[PDB]
């Protein structure tokens, strides 16, 4: 039946439902076919499937986070000690239900937690997340004199795409280079971030250039923020300042080649420390200070 | 260039070399004195006729000395100073022989455009001047020094190895109305005994001494006020070579805590070449002094060093016999004592 | 007798002598026409030529610096206060003489500058200056253990070009994006940057990013470097965090668009302060503490 | 200002063997009288008094050991709103010179609302107690605020009836007595 196939199914469209939610839905669909009453035929198979998915990954992180969350939910479910049928039914219901919830969470984020750009506080943004864009688009109907600043995105010109999404709302924008990132920290108020995950350490698992940005923010004391829908607390620890579960090579010193070939293995993923989140915007209340870690503890009861 | 010319004309080269290699020579001051004496001997005896050739000879000698020993900077410096002394006089002479404008004392633009006398006595006098300079640094420092530190403040003291530093401290301590508490770090495999001696001296001097294990710096830093380096040599971009062990870490700590770092030295200690490395300059001690045993101690490859290098950044002031200078400024002081072509022999 | 044409001369050719050298030569050639004797005829004309050059200048201050240096030299020349012919002849001589000098300067550099290489210490080269490349290429002649690291620069694909010149001599490398360079804290031992201008405080004008690099270096305590010959000197000191004469744009929040026309707008050129740099590379013996300001004092006296 | 902070100080001073000297900033707009009162109270008990101008903190901070506040409102990400005048700059100075910052706190005094902008929570003050006469006010523009906000980047402990807690942690404390539902009423 496959989760991989389901994942493939959505690509051209998307741009609405959270990825981690689609994956969860797929998992649920996979489950509700082969009898979810028994725990011997099922949980192990689910785990195997997850492993397979992990193996098959090109360059995607949050899947694991999603699946572990799902597992946790499942575990939580069968503590009521009543019967096998009702609980199973509830579990089955809770896949589509979870997907439905994501939209509500997004709504909550974009109507309560959008008071971080109000007094024309110019926004230096990097990391394309849906939530960040959703909040920005929802704040365009209030006309609170907002202004956008874009540091260029170069995995393969996502920057262009981003600038094309801000042209539908009609708002003055500007191209920024991440070498002249020391140059302009002046008129721009704060630095806001989209990402790929939040760590057990606290810091952010992100993209093509982030640690430098963080450093600069620290230097300037103009606060550094991360904005997302909350379900990216993967069981991972970046213990070093140049280590994570990485898809590509970590700085591959290529051999003495000839005609401009092996070069562009430029780090498309980077991370900065725990003493960098001035605030983190999440749908489970606006909570940050040691919140992720607390949540993890609550989950694993340790 | 070998010792082929210098035989029954000058002898003491070999002695100097011996003193350098096996370390019968001890303390930069003494080395400087030795070098001065060598120069005197050279002058009282050698045969000239010319001037450029003599200069070349001197350069070669300097080079040879450097090749014999690098860690002795004072030796080099004094030579350079004497060369500079000679050079100015030579320049003056040339002007009379031939028979000029410049905005300040020296020029960049005078290097682009096309540019028998009694110099020996002047050279002799230069050496004397140098000797005199060497004689007293402290008697030109304690007027810019018994100024910085105040009542109820707290000093932190690494490197009790430079004889100058101790003297500076004691001059400050002299006053009957000034009071300060002194923290002293050890420095283990190269400085312990010296540190102990310093502590004893402080105790004798009727002042509040505090003995510190090299570990326990962090448990006291809240109260800390000042930082004093016991440097041996000083260089181009400001920085210093130090009289061994237990200075770098403490300096770093101070920088982190933003607690002021002072440098006490001298301009004979001042050198006219860049420390492009620490490796080529700073030397290492003896692995034997840490641990006993030998056959299990082929496995126990232990690392320990004498001298210490500190980057220009952590240190802020270099109070001299001339006065208070800065890491940004000290280069010009060097230039005021050794000339532009004398940098490279 | 024209200067703009001369300037347009060297463009795709080069690869022989420093640009600011050709301009200087041109200036000298112009000078030996209207007589250095008649000061009323000459100096005014020189000034006019300089103004013309300025008018024709896009993104540079170095040509200006060169011409003012030349002027200063000329002024210095007449201080022998005697016969009005010998001085003129010397002036005439001193243009191709300047060109000749560069070679000698380079030679001087390739002996004192090769004192610096430490055992297994990885080098990163910023900007496009001939001098830095020469020093790096001259260090391979003595077979010294080292390495080179390229950065993805964006003016007219400069980074790519740089990485294309290091493959000619056969030198293993890896490519680093300007955003991604944050993670570079220990593995590259020493941070080198080439200078298109050095003025009063040892502050530097180059390309699409220097200040950020400097900041990063300061953060990691890794040593930062300024690498050139000797001709790039002006009487300058900037006002804010960064300030320069600009033919390009200083932060254009570009007007409403939907089809892509004009948006490529931000700080193309960047300045760095005094505190960031530990070592200065010139042929002027070995100096970095405060030889720049003092040099200027010696020159101008004003 | 408060009766709590004063009492805390008094309790410490009772053990007079414990050696501590008090520097007190006057607090320009409103705190002045209150500061004076505090000083008087200190004197009453026999506690060593040092009266401070607000411009002069940079000149004192390197000699200052420990700093105690007596705030009005405690917040989410760690910061506070204190009872008027001269706290932001002080905190900045402390951060620069690295100084320990105590704060007397209460959980009922603690608020679960998050402060996100200076543009709202900071409460401004009256020009009435600055300069008499209103004809110079035609051209010039007097700027003054009563109560000030602190970023958490600076303070380090909150001495409560429960215990001293970390600013980048106090949210948990609040939640051990408050909710996420009772926020936007």
Residue numbers in the entry:
A (entry chain A), C (entry chain B): 4 to 305
B (entry chain C): 10 to 108, 113 to 128, 147 to 376
D (entry chain D): 192 to 376
List passages from the publication reporting this PDB structure.
For multiple rounds of initiation to occur, the GDP on eIF2 has to be exchanged for GTP. This reaction is catalysed by a guanine nucleotide exchange factor (GEF) eIF2B. Here we have determined a cryoEM structure of eIF2B in complex with the GDP-bound form of eIF2 phosphorylated at Ser51 on the α subunit, which sheds light on the molecular interactions between the two molecules and provides a basis for understanding the regulation of translation by eIF2α phosphorylation. The structure consists of two eIF2 molecules bound to opposite sides of the eIF2B hetero-decamer.
The map obtained using a linear mode dataset only did not yield a high overall resolution (5.7 Å). To further account for the different conformations of eIF2 in the complex, we also carried out focused EM data classifications using combined dataset without applying any internal symmetry and we obtained another four density maps (maps A to D in Supplementary Fig. 1), however, at lower overall resolution. In two of these maps (B and D), we also observed in proximity to eIF2γ additional unknown low-resolution densities that could not be attributed to any region of eIF2 (extra density in map D). A second masked classification yielded a map at only 10.4 Å resolution but with a defined extra density, also of the size of eIF2B ε-cat domain, this time, on the other side of the eIF2γ-G-domain close enough to the nucleotide-binding region. Interestingly, this map also contained the density for eIF2β, not included in the mask. Our reconstructions of the eIF2B–eIF2(αP) complex show high mobility and flexibility of eIF2 γ and β around catalytic portion of eIF2B, while maintaining the stronger contact through eIF2α-D1.
